[PDB]
Amino acid sequence: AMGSMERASLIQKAKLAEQAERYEDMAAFMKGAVEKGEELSCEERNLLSVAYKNVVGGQRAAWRVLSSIEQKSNGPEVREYREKVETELQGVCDTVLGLLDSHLIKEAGDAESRVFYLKMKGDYYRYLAEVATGDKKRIIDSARSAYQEAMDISKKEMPPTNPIRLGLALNFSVFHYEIANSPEEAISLAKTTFDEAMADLHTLSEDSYKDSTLIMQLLRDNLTLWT
Amino acid sequence: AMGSMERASLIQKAKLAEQAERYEDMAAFMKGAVEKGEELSCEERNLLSVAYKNVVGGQRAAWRVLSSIEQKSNGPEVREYREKVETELQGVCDTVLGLLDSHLIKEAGDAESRVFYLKMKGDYYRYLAEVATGDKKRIIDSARSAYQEAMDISKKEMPPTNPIRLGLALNFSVFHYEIANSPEEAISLAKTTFDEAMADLHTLSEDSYKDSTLIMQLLRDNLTLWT
Amino acid sequence: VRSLSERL
Amino acid sequence: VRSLSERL
Ligand SMILES: N=C(N)c1cc(-c2ccccc2)c(CNC(=O)Cc2ccc3c(c2)OCO3)s1
Ligand SMILES: N=C(N)c1cc(-c2ccccc2)c(CNC(=O)Cc2ccc3c(c2)OCO3)s1
Ligand SMILES: [Mg+2]
Ligand SMILES: [Mg+2]
């Protein structure tokens, strides 16, 4: 439905939707922009990610509420409604994965863009894994493979303080702890990421230092919760 | 699309949607319940109101953000997107007004139900008036007429501390101040409502006292802002 | 600031 | 409590 709107207008409307907290509209505008077929800039990649993170985040929060109610009850209404929300969540994840596969990842040559999209791929397979059962194994391996490829590129091409590299390592650690039942892998990754970033902070400007230390704080918070 | 679901299941799903903060779903379930053609209980009326208040509240907040951006700019994007949100808001208000007119109000014989629905009618015409221009006059008179009929019934049939009567008077005072450019009418209504409720608190149980005083606090907050 | 209306 | 992932 966005095929008749100019790319630049879709991006401008995504920025307005963000200010208006209209995240479903924001995601639709950014999907339209991606479907124009041009690569996305750093700012545009962040708009895409913010839009879908907010949409799927609301769905995940709703699914967790309904799943909790359903687990305590063990009529069909709670199960039926949890299934409805689950199907909608899976549809949003499939949409994002489809944009990544057709054709954002294959056209991303720079490390910053390729790592960003591969991290997103890991994240949306992770959200699928949160609701999957038994099928679950295959989704988990898809998330792991995307995160691992992103990690390999990021370690070769980015400094340890780069915010994309840090956010990737953070989310992969969450994958290990919450999805893959590998809490020791999660703790090891978070600790090594934190320590390597700490030792690189001296190279950063005041602004970059703030960016990197904010994400490092999340690594430390998880380590506190996990140990 | 809800015509094939049992009334009781729609109500149960509305309650679940509320807990999951899925207010669009909640509104759709309650619309489906209303369209079964039976009158609504007090609890069901509150579910209907909560669902649509949350849906239109998000739209109103977005419209205000976009209208503010549009006013500062004076390309077509901000206007076009504000118009899109405005049209969606008007559609939600028209849906609620249509449920009230077909046929909730005419079937409401008790004062509690008739006052509740007439207040809702005033509220959704008020939300239409917030975005209307010039057409604006006719919407304003429709809101005023609904609120006034509700007031007349409430003064004859309910005590001054009844929460529906208090919320009606509160919202009618907001109408006078923000929509009808009648700030002195707003102040007079809020003051008289507050004082008459104060003098009736002695009749209430501890629970009812808490209910009534919470709404009275909003009357006092407005009087502070308005004077 | 805007006036406060009935809360849920 | 659940683990914290990357924030916007
Ligand atoms: N509209 C939006 N939402 C954004 C637009 C742009 C933008 C990008 C390029 C040019 C112009 C704008 C954004 C830039 N954000 C980042 O690059 C990542 C980041 C870095 C450090 C952090 C952090 C996140 O969280 C904790 O510390 S966000
Ligand atoms: N699911 C929901 N949202 C609700 C279900 C029921 C319910 C009603 C009847 C039977 C069972 C449940 C609700 C009852 N609320 C009121 O009647 C109005 C009210 C009174 C005093 C106040 C106030 C609002 O705000 C400030 O003080 S709300
Ligand atoms: Mg073009
Ligand atoms: Mg039936």
Side-chain angles (χ1 to χ4, degrees), chain A residues 1-70 73-83 85-111 113-134 136 138-154 157-209 211-224 226-227, chain B residues 1-70 73-83 85-111 113-134 136 138-154 157-209 211-224 226-227, chain C, chain D:
Chain A
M2 302 299 181
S4 68
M5 201 180 309
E6 287 279 18
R7 190 183 186 282
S9 293
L10 290 165
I11 292 160
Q12 183 182 352
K13 290 180 183 180
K15 292 176 183 174
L16 294 168
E18 185 180 26
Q19 289 173 257
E21 289 175 31
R22 293 271 293 192
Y23 297 108
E24 294 182 0
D25 287 350
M26 192 188 180
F29 292 137
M30 288 311 300
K31 174 175 189 290
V34 169
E35 288 174 347
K36 299 301 177 184
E38 310 276 9
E39 292 182 29
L40 302 196
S41 72
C42 170
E43 184 170 10
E44 294 164 356
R45 288 196 295 275
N46 280 283
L47 292 168
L48 179 69
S49 177
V50 165
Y52 278 107
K53 186 46 158 51
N54 274 278
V55 173
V56 80
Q59 294 171 318
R60 291 164 73 208
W63 186 93
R64 291 167 176 160
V65 166
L66 298 169
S67 186
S68 178
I69 295 169
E70 186 184 12
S73 78
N74 300 335
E77 286 84 0
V78 186
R79 170 191 58 78
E80 285 171 348
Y81 186 44
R82 187 268 299 157
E83 288 170 352
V85 170
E86 184 173 301
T87 298
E88 295 188 5
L89 183 164
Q90 291 166 328
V92 168
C93 292
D94 289 343
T95 294
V96 171
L97 294 166
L99 297 173
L100 294 170
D101 192 59
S102 301
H103 299 277
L104 286 170
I105 290 167
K106 70 170 59 65
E107 288 302 335
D110 291 355
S113 60
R114 190 170 186 85
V115 171
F116 189 98
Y117 294 135
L118 285 168
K119 177 186 165 292
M120 286 190 51
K121 184 174 184 174
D123 287 338
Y124 286 85
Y125 275 115
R126 172 161 59 89
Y127 306 148
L128 288 175
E130 289 178 341
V131 306
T133 57
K136 173 91 159 309
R138 192 176 297 278
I139 295 167
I140 290 176
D141 206 53
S142 290
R144 186 192 310 276
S145 178
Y147 281 135
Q148 187 59 57
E149 184 178 350
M151 290 287 298
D152 291 340
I153 299 165
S154 72
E157 304 290 351
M158 297 169 156
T161 48
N162 177 281
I164 304 160
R165 178 168 166 182
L166 289 173
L168 166 62
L170 173 64
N171 285 7
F172 197 16
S173 74
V174 171
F175 169 83
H176 288 309
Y177 191 93
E178 297 288 351
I179 307 299
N181 201 37
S182 300
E184 283 164 340
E185 186 72 19
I187 290 163
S188 183
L189 178 55
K191 280 177 171 167
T192 53
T193 299
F194 184 95
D195 287 348
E196 294 178 7
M198 276 291 306
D200 192 58
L201 290 172
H202 68 95
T203 68
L204 299 183
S205 72
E206 173 178 310
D207 284 358
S208 296
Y209 178 93
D211 286 344
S212 298
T213 58
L214 290 174
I215 304 163
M216 291 170 63
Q217 183 64 57
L218 300 178
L219 292 163
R220 180 57 64 187
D221 291 341
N222 283 338
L223 282 167
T224 297
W226 296 343
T227 70
Chain B
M2 302 299 181
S4 68
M5 201 180 309
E6 287 279 18
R7 190 183 186 282
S9 293
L10 290 165
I11 292 160
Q12 183 182 352
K13 290 180 183 180
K15 292 176 183 174
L16 294 168
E18 185 180 26
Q19 289 173 257
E21 289 175 31
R22 293 271 293 192
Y23 297 108
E24 294 182 0
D25 287 350
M26 192 188 180
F29 292 137
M30 288 311 300
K31 174 175 189 290
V34 169
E35 288 174 347
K36 299 301 177 184
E38 310 276 9
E39 292 182 29
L40 302 196
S41 72
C42 170
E43 184 170 10
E44 294 164 356
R45 288 196 295 275
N46 280 283
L47 292 168
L48 179 69
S49 177
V50 165
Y52 278 107
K53 186 46 158 51
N54 274 278
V55 173
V56 80
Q59 294 171 318
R60 291 164 73 208
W63 186 93
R64 291 167 176 160
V65 166
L66 298 169
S67 186
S68 178
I69 295 169
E70 186 184 12
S73 78
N74 300 335
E77 286 84 0
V78 186
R79 170 191 58 78
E80 285 171 348
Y81 186 44
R82 187 268 299 157
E83 288 170 352
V85 170
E86 184 173 301
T87 298
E88 295 188 5
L89 183 164
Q90 291 166 328
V92 168
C93 292
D94 289 343
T95 294
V96 171
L97 294 166
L99 297 173
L100 294 170
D101 192 59
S102 301
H103 299 277
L104 286 170
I105 290 167
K106 70 170 59 65
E107 288 302 335
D110 291 355
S113 60
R114 190 170 186 85
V115 171
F116 189 98
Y117 294 135
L118 285 168
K119 177 186 165 292
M120 286 190 51
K121 184 174 184 174
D123 287 338
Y124 286 85
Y125 275 115
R126 172 161 59 89
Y127 306 148
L128 288 175
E130 289 178 341
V131 306
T133 57
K136 173 91 159 309
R138 192 176 297 278
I139 295 167
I140 290 176
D141 206 53
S142 290
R144 186 192 310 276
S145 178
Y147 281 135
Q148 187 59 57
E149 184 178 350
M151 290 287 298
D152 291 340
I153 299 165
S154 72
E157 304 290 351
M158 297 169 156
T161 48
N162 177 281
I164 304 160
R165 178 168 166 182
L166 289 173
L168 166 62
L170 173 64
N171 285 7
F172 197 16
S173 74
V174 171
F175 169 83
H176 288 309
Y177 191 93
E178 297 288 351
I179 307 299
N181 201 37
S182 300
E184 283 164 340
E185 186 72 19
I187 290 163
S188 183
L189 178 55
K191 280 177 171 167
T192 53
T193 299
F194 184 95
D195 287 348
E196 294 178 7
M198 276 291 306
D200 192 58
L201 290 172
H202 68 95
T203 68
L204 299 183
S205 72
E206 173 178 310
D207 284 358
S208 296
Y209 178 93
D211 286 344
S212 298
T213 58
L214 290 174
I215 304 163
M216 291 170 63
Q217 183 64 57
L218 300 178
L219 292 163
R220 180 57 64 187
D221 291 341
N222 283 338
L223 282 167
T224 297
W226 296 343
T227 70
Chain C
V1 51
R2 293 178 183 274
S3 306
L4 307 179
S5 62
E6 177 202 49
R7 328 217 299 238
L8 323 164
Chain D
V1 51
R2 293 178 183 274
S3 306
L4 307 179
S5 62
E6 177 202 49
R7 328 217 299 238
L8 323 164

